[PDB]
């Protein structure tokens, strides 16, 4: 049994609990956030995007019990003050968005935790892993690691397949992304000074920056410095699409590209020929779902520009990858 | 030339500035918030609901200039620390949502301001004004006042007209309300513990509490304790509807009720027979817009239940009412 | 083993199919619509509100196979031309919205069908059933019956409980309703000339008329002519709320009313004290979900006004009620 | 100049809004499938473009706008309309069903002198993007096309790019507001598109567009050099055209932004403000280049260039349409 704590019971943290609660390999001992147990339990029970929790929840003072299993609730904003050493937690899932670095997240280790998995990009001085792309880099000795971004978990398998089959010279990624909690409800100042994430999330197409493409080198070293891109946040509650426009080493046809993708398909990376829309990927277990209906190739003179697209649920896809990586790290 | 400050450059503060900036009676000296001048200027220039500002904005350091007039910007979370005295500010529009009480809002007076107008309900010990309903209660000597809530400004003229013409013994109010910034973007803990405002604003029907009906007595004393109600927040960016289901002292007809409403119509209280929808009231100047097409009467054993509905833009309707009450207060 | 055809593979039809593949008592022989099998199969596999279908779907010329069982696809706009006798269908689920009457829906019988369940109000010359309110009236002699409206399936159990415990003299219903396929995507002319459903569905609060309250007289005869109401369509994809403001024959308390509701709770009528929002009822099997957090009472001069509310998934709640009524009709 | 409108839809009603205070045209008639009460109500109130600034009165079979009367008809077949009896000078074909010379010429048979089609209508006629190729107009044209909204956004941007640096090839992606050809909720679709069948306001909906492939009709040098697709997202109006392209010359972000600013005109605007989609609702530009979204990535000696332009797919296109209308009749 592996003792896990969750710091930051948000979209990712709560969905992580949903994925770990039924699997006997883990024991979620505690959850830390900024609120009381009643609030945490209600948010776990009811979800506007992922549906009702299938199980039973009851709340007790300073704790709540899910499926008969009790979980201590704490409210410490400073991780070094947490009781990880006292409950002897094995791994902390750092899901707050505030401690995404080796320096900052290591406060969990000083608090007594043996290992930490960060739910975001956390710099380049620690292992960053996209499951079924580079999880082989783990040997079990790593105290703090990053599960990368949702967008890298969508893009990496696609870019790796393209590079391995045809060699990818370069490309531009644009992700049409569901809005998230870092955007305002209505136009208002933003905490980090972003004048676009300041705007009403569900009423706008909101251009935004993302480093997923520039940082791919941390996951696929061969592609370091070969991709860039940005995002457009749009008014869907969850569900996103990654488009990649690129040039390859070899002339290709749509059929050849789609076949390479199907051949690279696994549990993390899926393949579909159905003309789906975003609402159809909510809650999927794949980290990436390649959409063969969106493959397009244009040729001028002898040079090809290739466009590919893969769906992902920035919540469920990422969290499933995060739990795959958590299982690998503790094995 | 009245020296105004705005504390909290939010939805209401920015729309207040929009309504005062063309207006010669006010000079807006300062704005206080929690961010820098470039952010306030950007948010004033571009609006997701109220459209782009028609005018020119330039950003200096620590201030910005609107249509050639400079406004100093400050970022002090504690109002008592504000430089209202040194700027000789006459009225502060308290629009943050954090000082809506006599005691808390009086810190502006301690900061050196002469008067404070609060843009929300602020308790029972202060004058609360819905313009063109009870604004005669103002005499000019009041240092702090409340402009009431958006729902109170929509409901009050409707309930006053019904009471005056037919006697309103009791009623229930329901406001189908646009979501606001006190609701979360996606499901998440909520600062004030509301498990319903914690849910994703633009994805849900969210029942919520409101004191607009219970507190109507502060605006229409004859109606103290005769109304109650609640809200349903729904996914529109702005624009709202107040429904009132009530019993009256007098049998009435649809035509009678509608005529009573039109007869009470003014700049604050409007009347329409067009089958409009919420997006059509965005930016209107009325504090309340009675919809004669929604009037319904049901009679059982000779006893009637009456349903009426009035539209409002919870932002522009309220802000226009607030500037009306401000002008009246400083013209006194 | 009862052979069922579905006419109109829409929101109600497709969800009916989702619920009947579970039940071995039915076999769905055919589906009729205005399009091909590829599209019907695709729309059945993927749903923006009710999620992906968990099961297997394959497409065949003029048919598609679900969980290994084949279903015939037809595209005849006129029901009299259907092959119901050839297929010997026992019951047709009439879900198009165009044949909602005894006279029009009897064309299914002329095509050779034994019985018709209309998924909408179909007039007062028919048996209209809200399961677990008046389904005891069914005896097997009925060629055509109506499953009533979604809103009546939400309101009836609540109104019945109120009437049974305390006597319901009169009441006004207001439903806060998800938008539907009879509203336009963007502002445009409307097929029925309604200037409000002509407006952009996902951008507005849209007042609308409904007979759900008046039609309660067909399901609860004691309450004939005692209720009326209206609707407000709001930008959620599915999930709705029914509010009721009413007067009773007896004085009551909030907890007394809530206790009566919990007591009347069953498979069709659910009871909750959780402060839920609309997205939380998507896909529920109840026809009505009474929300104890919304009960309120107003007392003035000793006469009370009572406000209660029930949630419903206007799609799944109604469809589950519809399948319950269909099983009841074919069991007799 | 006697202007009539066939199809009082999103484009038609906004066109009338723009022509009310233009002293050179007077609108004489409007044809649609509904009565004057509905048309007047839809002209008065609009969910995206706000209330009409003016007074509307509805007479018998006509309505008066700001004192000026306009008769209304209900003919689904354009050949049966009384353009001859009304001596119409130019008809705006805005239904979406007669987008071809052969079909739109029925206006000519009813007695219409000139027809401007508010959509792409084939290669047999002049298709014009104002301030891109409008000088091709002389007096002699009875039928012309105003192109698509997406072409009116892309064309000036692509032209500036070609003229300054030479566009080898490019892939366009437009993040587009949903439109009335998408379903409100999931349901069969009349043209069989399984994606436009899905609920418009709940999904990211990939869609095809010919705006890129057809650019050759507006900029002949670029025939067969661009392609692209669309993504429909839940905003009521407002759209963004992103272009990923390769150029003949090596460039810098500053060079591209300067070349765009140099091309600035009433049709093609320039901004460095970090705006969002709702900020372009109702703008008078056919295209608004966004300098904040320019990106260049370089691998070996080869560059990929990304640029983006906003447009209000309704107001931008309609403003362009009436500009082309004025030009067409000046001659
Ligand atoms: N949401 C996504 O789509 C997504 C996808 C991939 C990665 N991530 C990453 O996951 C992390 C969490 O994101 P989220 O979407 O779940 O956001 P969220 O806002 O939903 O979750 C944040 C939670 O952390 C809690 N928290 C904040 N400060 C805290 C502190 N000092 N101590 C304890 N708890 C605290 C908050 O109260 C909130 O409950 C972020 O770094 C995000 O970048 C998010
Ligand atoms: N939005 C409506 O529909 C509406 C209608 C009528 C009244 N009101 C009331 O107006 C008030 C403001 O609401 P809003 O909708 O504009 O909300 P908002 O969140 O958009 O505005 C809040 C603003 O106040 C600022 N702020 C917070 N604390 C501050 C402090 N200590 N000092 C300076 N600035 C601070 C924030 O940075 C933000 O700019 C609330 O009390 C609300 O109840 C709102
Ligand atoms: N959706 C709800 O919330 C709800 C609730 C209760 C009752 N109902 C009732 O159910 C009925 C269907 O509604 P819906 O929401 O599923 O609408 P919908 O528009 O999704 O379904 C209509 C379907 O019927 C098909 N159709 C139309 N005419 C036809 C014909 N002549 N022959 C064969 N097929 C035809 C259409 O192609 C479409 O697929 C309506 O009467 C509605 O009022 C709907
Ligand atoms: N909406 C945009 O963003 C946009 C941009 C550029 C071009 N267009 C083009 O403009 C045209 C109209 O699009 P829209 O957005 O106005 O759609 P819309 O659905 O709002 O307008 C269609 C109108 O035409 C009427 N109509 C349909 N058939 C008719 C007939 N036979 N006779 C007379 N009237 C008829 C309908 O009643 C409706 O009022 C389309 O061809 C579209 O491609 C649209």
TrEMBL record, chains B, C:
Supply the InterPro entries for this chain. Answer: GlycerAld/Erythrose_P_DH, GlycerAld_3-P_DH_AS, GlycerAld_3-P_DH_cat, GlycerAld_3-P_DH_NAD(P)-bd, Glyceraldehyde-3-P_DH_1, NAD(P)-bd_dom_sf
Group of enzyme by EC:
oxidoreductase
Residue positions annotated to bind D-glyceraldehyde 3-phosphate are 149-151, 180, 210-211, 233
Q: Cite the EC number.
A: 1.2.1.-
Q: Print the keywords alphabetically.
A: NAD, Nucleotide-binding, Oxidoreductase
Record: residues binding NAD(+): 11-12, 33, 119, 314
Q: Where is the active site?
A: 150 (nucleophile)
What's the protein name? Glyceraldehyde-3-phosphate dehydrogenase
Q: Which species does this protein come from?
A: Clostridium perfringens (strain SM101 / Type A)
Gene this chain is encoded by:
gap
């Amino acid at each position: 049994m592996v003792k896990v704590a969750i710091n930051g019971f948000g979209r990712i943290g709560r969905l992580a609990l949903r994925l770990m609660i039924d699997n006997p390999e883990f024991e979620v001992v505690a959850i830390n956030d900024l609120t009381d147990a009643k609030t945490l339990a209600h948010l776990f029970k009811y979800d506007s995007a992922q549906g009702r929790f299938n199980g039973e929840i009851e709340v007790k003072e300073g704790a709540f019990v899910v499926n008969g299993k009790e979980i201590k609730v704490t409210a410490k904003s400073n991780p070094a003050e947490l009781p990880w050493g006292e409950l002897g937690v094995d791994v902390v899932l750092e899901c707050t968005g505030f401690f995404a670095s080796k320096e900052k997240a290591s406060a969990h280790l000083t608090a007594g935790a043996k290992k930490v998995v960060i739910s975001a990009p956390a710099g380049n001085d620690l292992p960053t892993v996209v499951y079924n792309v580079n999880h082989d880099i783990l040997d079990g000795s790593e105290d703090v690691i990053s599960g990368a971004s949702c967008t890298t978990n969508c893009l990496a398998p696609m870019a790796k397949a393209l590079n391995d089959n045809f060699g990818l010279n370069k490309g531009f990624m644009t992700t049409i992304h569901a809005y998230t909690n870092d955007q305002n409800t209505l136009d208002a100042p933003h905490k980090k000074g972003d004048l676009r994430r300041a705007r009403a999330a569900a009423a706008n197409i909101v251009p935004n920056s993302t480093g997923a493409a520039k940082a791919i080198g941390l996951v696929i070293p061969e592609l370091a410095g070969k991709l860039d891109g940005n995002a457009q946040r749009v008014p869907v509650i969850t569900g996103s699409l990654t488009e990649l426009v690129c040039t390859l080493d070899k002339k290709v046809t749509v059929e050849e590209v789609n076949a390479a993708m199907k051949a690279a398909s696994n549990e993390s990376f899926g393949y579909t020929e159905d003309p789906i829309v975003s609402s159809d990927v909510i809650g999927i277990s794949f980290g990436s779902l390649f959409d063969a209906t969106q493959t397009k190739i244009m040729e001028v003179d002898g040079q090809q520009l290739v466009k590919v697209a893969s769906w992902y649920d920035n919540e469920a896809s990422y969290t499933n990858q995060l739990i795959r990586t958590l299982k690998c790290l503790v094995s």
